[PDB]
Amino acid sequence: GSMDAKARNCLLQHREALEKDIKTSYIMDHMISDGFLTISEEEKVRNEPTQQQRAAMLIKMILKKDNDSYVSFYNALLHEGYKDLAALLHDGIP
Ligand SMILES: [Zn+2]
Ligand SMILES: [Zn+2]
Numbered sequence: 591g592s593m594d595a596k597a598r599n600c601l602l603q604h605r606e607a608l609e610k611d612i613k614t615s616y617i618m619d620h621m622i623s624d625g626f627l628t629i630s631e632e633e634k635v636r637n638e639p640t641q642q643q644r645a646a647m648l649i650k651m652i653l654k655k656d657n658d659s660y661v662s663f664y665n666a667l668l669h670e671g672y673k674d675l676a677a678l679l680h681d682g683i684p
């Protein structure tokens with residue numbers, strides 16, 4: 591947990607909404623392509639049986655990463671068709 595309290599708390603207040611609407615495949619590929627998510631972390635997520643479960647795992651790991659990885663996630667949401675979810679996280683981005 592290297593991310594600032596402000597960012598973490600914002601993500602927590604919207605945890606439920608994110609895990610419900612996102613598809614991890616596209617987001618993770620964008621993050622890896624961007625260089626802020628490892629293939630080892632991606633494999634662990636893909637290994638989950640359901641969409642919500644994969645999303646929950648992705649969120650769980652994001653919470654353990656730093657500020658630049660959180661920004662990558664934020665940027666991945668914006669480019670992968672999740673503007674509404676990103677707008678919720680905007681005020682908390684470092
Ligand atoms: Zn916020
Ligand atoms: Zn909020």
Ligand SMILES: [Zn+2]
Pocket residue numbers: 618619622632
């Ligand atoms: Zn991949």
Ligand SMILES: [Zn+2]
Pocket residue numbers: 656657658659
């Ligand atoms: Zn980093």
Ligand SMILES: [Zn+2]
Pocket residue numbers: 620624665666669
């Ligand atoms: Zn990007």
Ligand SMILES: [Zn+2]
Pocket residue numbers: 665669
């Ligand atoms: Zn961009």
